[PDB]
């Protein structure tokens, strides 16, 4: 065997994860979201952009998460052992994997930023994270975390809540699945994505988490409804 | 009601599980593996064995897990609060259910043992576990654990990491599922098995766990690649 | 005529060949191996490798020889005039032709090394031999030797046992041959490769040599059996 | 490794092999024998025997070797450094593999013994050799040796001359091969068996060895000619 010394950064991350799993009673809720309309809308938006920017699926996911957080503010809360702080702004931390570990750059005001602005912010913060130039205020804080591992082929997974937040959305890969249809063949093909929200049961109960996931699924399945 | 006294063995097992769940920040990643090629290869190998031995699906799973651990040594590490011990050998603990409880006989050097050797070792250790003659060195230790409940009809499940290891692979049942295909019928039938890897987030982050699962899936979906 | 002085290296090689042919009672056994499945598996493995490495037929031959040596340890012995040293590990010397003569770089632990590892080791040692950078421990020793001359079109040949080993496998070229089959045409085409094992009759008798060749032929004719 | 002590019997056998390969200038000649008529005659003879005895292909081979030795007495000689002893009787040593090694029970007067008598003698001597009950005169001596390894699948092999004899016939496996014919299909299927005669070049030169092999091939290709 080989003993690799633990860095101070890794020790801090491990201590944060220990604190989260010891003080936050996690419980996980998983749903499936149909992504055909999102893919069509994304293709049309990318065609219209004419190479000025590129809209990714994670941008749609971040926007839908911010809007669902607005609709269900309980998922946008924090437990402080005396009061439940209900944040009125949605600062979406985005999990990014770098050679030094996992870091969470924050897209601030994702509930009011547009898809192009969100995409540009995500690209800029990802480049900063990969280059190791992130400032502490750019990754400390936030009210809701999104960790997307679909690019690695994960069907679904359950993540750890980043304190002091109340939820974290774990995003898996999009795969084509067969579904019943009232057609001659008897079936259709739909590109579905499995998302698992890990909730702090002190703040978000089962009904509230389910309502949040339903709102998120509705927003993704009808992208034009993000205009409302 | 009836009060059943707790044996000392059960107390030790419960204390170990408590220690794992309070000191290891578990997080779970699940994927689906196509098992048709493994079934075909296993049938051919069993036919050429002519009754000298019999290879089970768990032997293929153990071999694939050992090779994936070689490819991604982070899943073959341990957290010792000062250094991360990265084991260079793969000793696969295998969960076996006996009337006295759950025990974990260890197949040593599964990364270099062949399928016949793995199958014979598993059969011998399972018989020893069921008849209660396991020596402490034959079930204490290991670097990676595999718990298979597919024989009981479980679709998938999330296990508890056996300390001080960093991961545990939970294997469910293999079932036939319809999938889209470019044929006249529009679909095909493939036997998939869902596997859920529970990882210690202090050692294995999401990207590393996903990479491990991807290598494991590749090894199982093309068995000839285990020759590499 | 022209008198070319004999180098000391050539004198040493010639003296070793004298010692082998004078003290080792060679006897040779030849078989034919069908290589269609080996070629198919090699093509699939190379396509999976995506250019990271390239697997040659000699890698399959080395792996099969190592596994056959495991199954029949008599071919993995050495005569020491008082005891028969039966080596438990398989170090395969590989005959490499360089402008300075014939050299035998050793692939250690070929019985546990995979095909990709064996291929990489063979490529590295061949490059070192061609550049004249081999260290003495990298070509002195070994338990079993493989000399392949199929690249030069040799149908079959009988090699000289490298002392103090007990056997040497001489591999010829692979050619398409017609064989009877139960089809409409009455025949089929198979790529067959002829190998001649030269054995020390003190250690390996005819039945043992034939058993070794049968095991080697089975391993090559069904590559999936190399996983056992 | 493991050092296996050399038994005195093995030392004697090894010393005999040293003496043979050091004092006898071996040279090897190979031919192919069509065995369709031998198989047909053997089937008819076995059906006539009605279970009283069973005739093997090795019995035909022994009879043909004895008759060929009668026709060409040079292969039935011995070099004694002063005279060439030309034996007028044909005592065929037969190579038998036993757990203790290789032994050579002698069928005396095979040139006058019939196929049934030869088969019974071979069976009895093989049983005695396997049970370790052979007397020294039953395996010491002989004028010509036959070593058959076709049962192990060897295509062909070259054996070591047992001193002080002048030749040894190494018999390989019989396989179906396609050969041109003047029929509609353009080919036929024949079961051909390849034999390699190793000759002492002091006694038997190339032309004499070739004549012996031609006589042997004729005798086997037409069994009715064994009556002459």
**What counts of helices (H) and strands (E) characterise chain D?**
6, 12
| Residue B7 DSSP class | P
The DSSP bridge partners found for residue C93 are C106, C145
Buried b (16+ CB within 10 A) or exposed e, D5-37: ebeeebeebbeebbebbeebebebbbbbbbbeb
Q: Which helix (H) or strand (E) holds B32?
A: strand B26-34
Which string of DSSP letters, residue by residue, matches C89-103? S--EEE-EEETTEEE
- Chain C interface, best mutation among B42, B114, B119, B228, by max C CB count within 10 A: B228
Pairing of strands B83-86, B77-79: antiparallel
Of B201, B84, B79, B22, give the one whose Cα is nearest residue A162. B201
d(C-alpha B1, C-alpha A133), whole Å: 62
d(C-alpha B219, C-alpha A15), whole Å: 34
Q: Is the Cβ pair D1, C86 closer than 8 Å? A: yes
Q: Is the Cβ pair B88, A17 closer than 8 Å? A: no
Experimental method: cryo-EM
Which string of DSSP letters, residue by residue, matches A65-106? HHHHHHH-GGGGEEE-SS-EEE-SS--EEE-EEETTEEE--E
Query: Would you call A177 helix, strand, or coil by DSSP?
Result: strand
Q: How many Cα atoms within 13 Å fall on the side-chain side of residue B101?
A: 11
The DSSP bridge partners found for residue C79 are C84
C217 to chain D: closest CA residue: D153
**Residue C163 CB-density burial (10 A; 0-12 exposed, 13-18 middle, 19+ buried):** middle
Q: Is the Cβ pair A2, B186 closer than 8 Å? A: no
d(C-alpha A112, C-alpha A66), whole Å: 8
The DSSP bridge partners found for residue D34 are D192
Q: Is the Cβ pair C45, B224 closer than 8 Å? A: yes
Q: Is the Cβ pair B223, C228 closer than 8 Å? A: no
Query: Would you call C105 helix, strand, or coil by DSSP?
Result: coil
d(C-alpha D217, C-alpha D64), whole Å: 8
What does the radius of gyration of chain C's CA atoms come to, in whole angstroms?
A: 18
Buried b (16+ CB within 10 A) or exposed e, B207-217: bbbbbbbbbbb
C119 to chain B: closest CA residue: B228
CA angle C119, C69, B221 (to 5 degrees): 50
d(C-alpha C203, C-alpha C225), whole Å: 27
The DSSP bridge partners found for residue C189 are C178
- Chain D interface, best mutation among C158, C166, C195, C210, by max D CB count within 10 A: C210
Q: Is the Cβ pair B45, C115 closer than 8 Å? A: no
Contacts of residues A202-206 at CB distance under 8 Å and 24 or more positions apart, as own/partner, are A202/A24, A202/A25, A202/A79, A203/A74, A203/A77, A203/A78, A203/A79, A203/A84, A203/A166, A204/A74, A204/A75, A204/A77, A204/A166, A204/A167, A206/A27, A206/A29
Q: Is the Cβ pair A95, B206 closer than 8 Å? A: yes
d(C-alpha D144, C-alpha D95), whole Å: 11
Whose structure tokens read 């000793």? B91
- What are residue D39's phi and psi, to 5 degrees? -65, -40
- The contact set of C with D (CB < 8 A) is 22-23, 25-32, 77, 79-89, 158, 178-180, 186-187, 194, 201-202, 205-207, 209-211, 213-214, 217
Q: Are A7 and A163 in contact (CB under 8 A)?
A: no
Q: Is the Cβ pair A153, B186 closer than 8 Å? A: no
Of the candidates B116, B225, B228, the beta carbon closest to that of C228 is on B116
- Chain B interface, best mutation among C57, C89, C220, C224, by max B CB count within 10 A: C224
**What counts of helices (H) and strands (E) characterise chain C?**
6, 10
Helix D57-71 to helix D115-131 angle (10° resolution) is: 110
Q: Are D177 and D190 in contact (CB under 8 A)?
A: yes
Give the distance from residue C59's alpha carbon to the nearest chain D alpha carbon, in angstroms.
24
Q: Are B131 and B153 in contact (CB under 8 A)?
A: no
Residues in chain A: 228
- Chain C interface, best mutation among B64, B110, B224, B225, by max C CB count within 10 A: B224
Longest dimension (CA), chain A: 63
CB-based touch A/B (3+ pairs, under 8 A): yes
d(C-alpha C25, C-alpha C203), whole Å: 10
Contacts of residues C79-85 at CB distance under 8 Å and 24 or more positions apart, as own/partner, are C79/C164, C79/C166, C79/C200, C79/C202, C79/C203, C79/D14, C80/C164, C80/D3, C81/D6, C82/D5, C82/D6, C83/D3, C83/D4, C83/D5, C83/D6, C84/C203, C84/D3, C84/D4, C84/D5, C84/D6, C85/D1, C85/D2, C85/D3, C85/D4
Torsion of CA B109, B75, B94, B164, to 10 degrees: 100
d(C-alpha C26, C-alpha C28), whole Å: 7
Counting one residue from chain C and one from chain D, the pairs whose CB atoms sit within 8 A come to 102
Q: Is the Cβ pair A149, B213 closer than 8 Å? A: no
Q: Is the Cβ pair C86, D4 closer than 8 Å? A: yes
Residues of B in contact with C226 (CB under 8 A): 227
Q: Are B84 and A101 in contact (CB under 8 A)?
A: no
d(C-alpha C13, C-alpha C162), whole Å: 10
Cα-Cα-Cα-Cα dihedral sign, residues C3, C8, C9, C10: positive
Q: Do you find a cis peptide bond into D167, omega within 30 degrees of 0? A: no
Beta-carbon neighbour count of residue C29 at 10 Å?
27
d(C-alpha A152, C-alpha A163), whole Å: 25
Of the candidates A160, A176, A177, the beta carbon closest to that of B201 is on A160
In the set B91, B137, B200, B205, the catalytic residue is B205
Query: Would you call B12 helix, strand, or coil by DSSP?
Result: helix
Q: Are B138 and B106 in contact (CB under 8 A)?
A: yes
Q: Distance of CA B66 to CAs A152, B72, B73, B95, D101, Å? A: 20, 10, 10, 15, 42
Torsion of CA A121, A127, A131, A135, to 10 degrees: 0
- The contact set of C with B (CB < 8 A) is 41, 44-45, 48-49, 63, 112, 114-117, 222-228
Q: Is the Cβ pair B112, C115 closer than 8 Å? A: no
Q: Is the Cβ pair C202, D13 closer than 8 Å? A: yes
B87 to chain A: closest CA residue: A1
Of the candidates C27, C86, C217, the beta carbon closest to that of D2 is on C86
Residues of D in contact with C186 (CB under 8 A): 185, 187
Of D193, D221, D199, give the one whose Cα is nearest residue D69. D199
Q: Are D102 and C201 in contact (CB under 8 A)?
A: no
Tokens matching residue D12: 């004697």
d(C-alpha D144, C-alpha D169), whole Å: 8
Give the distance from residue C22's alpha carbon to the nearest chain D alpha carbon, in angstroms.
7
Q: How many Cα atoms within 13 Å fall on the side-chain side of residue B225?
A: 21
A5 to chain B: closest CA residue: B83
d(C-alpha D31, C-alpha D181), whole Å: 20
d(C-alpha C74, C-alpha A135), whole Å: 67
Beta-carbon neighbour count of residue C191 at 10 Å?
15
Q: Are B195 and B216 in contact (CB under 8 A)?
A: yes
Tokens matching residue A154: 């994960």
**What counts of helices (H) and strands (E) characterise chain A?**
6, 12
Q: Is the Cβ pair C227, B226 closer than 8 Å? A: yes
Residues of B in contact with A102 (CB under 8 A): 205-207
Q: Distance of CA D94 to CAs D11, D99, D108, D147, Å? A: 21, 16, 11, 6
Q: Are A28 and B106 in contact (CB under 8 A)?
A: no
Of the candidates A4, A158, A185, the beta carbon closest to that of B28 is on A158
CA angle A168, A173, A174 (to 5 degrees): 120
B178 to chain A: closest CA residue: A178
d(C-alpha B137, C-alpha A68), whole Å: 53
Catalytic residues of D: 201, 205
Of the candidates D21, D102, D153, the beta carbon closest to that of C31 is on D153
Give the distance from residue D17's alpha carbon to the nearest chain C alpha carbon, in angstroms.
6
Q: Which helix (H) or strand (E) holds D93?
A: strand D92-94
Of the candidates C41, C112, C117, the beta carbon closest to that of B224 is on C41
Q: Distance of CA D99 to CAs A36, A183, D102, Å? A: 72, 73, 8
Q: Is the Cβ pair D157, C28 closer than 8 Å? A: yes
Buried b (16+ CB within 10 A) or exposed e, A163-198: ebbbbbbbbbbbbebbeeeeeeeeeeebebbbbbbb
Q: Which helix (H) or strand (E) holds D118?
A: helix D115-131
Of D3, D17, D29, give the one whose Cα is nearest residue D213. D29
Beta-carbon neighbour count of residue A83 at 10 Å?
9
Residues of C in contact with B116 (CB under 8 A): 228
Residues of B in contact with A187 (CB under 8 A): 186-187
Give the distance from residue B145's alpha carbon to the nearest chain C alpha carbon, in angstroms.
22
Catalytic residues of A: 201, 205
Which residues 6+ apart lie within 8 Å of D87 measured at CB?
D73, D76, D77, D78, D143
Q: Is the Cβ pair B228, C112 closer than 8 Å? A: no
Q: How many Cα atoms within 13 Å fall on the side-chain side of residue A39?
A: 11
């Amino acid at each position: 065997f080989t003993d690799i010394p633990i860095s101070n950064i890794r020790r801090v991350i491990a201590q944060r994860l220990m604190q989260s799993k010891q003080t936050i009673p996690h419980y996980y809720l998983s749903v499936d979201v149909n992504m055909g309309e999102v893919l069509l809308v994304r293709k049309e938006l990318n065609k219209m952009l004419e190479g000025r920017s590129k809209i990714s699926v994670n941008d749609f996911i971040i926007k839908a998460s911010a809007l669902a957080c607005l609709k269900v503010p309980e998922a946008n809360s924090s437990w402080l052992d005396t009061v439940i702080r209900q944040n009125h702004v949605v600062d979406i931390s985005v999990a990014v994997s770098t050679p030094a570990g996992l870091i969470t750059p924050i897209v601030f005001n994702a509930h009011i930023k547009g898809l192009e602005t969100i995409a540009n912010d995500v690209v800029s913060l990802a480049t900063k994270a990969r280059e190791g130039k992130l400032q502490p205020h750019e990754f400390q804080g936030g009210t809701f975390t999104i960790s997307n591992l679909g690019m690695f082929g994960i069907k679904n997974f359950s993540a750890i809540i980043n304190p002091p937040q109340a939820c974290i959305l774990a995003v898996g890969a999009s795969e084509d699945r067969l579904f019943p249809a009232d057609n001659e063949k008897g079936f259709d093909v739909a590109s579905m994505m499995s998302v698992t929200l890990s909730c702090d049961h002190r703040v978000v109960d089962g009904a509230v988490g389910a309502q949040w996931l339903a709102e998120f699924r509705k927003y993704l399945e009808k992208p034009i409804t993000m205009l409302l």
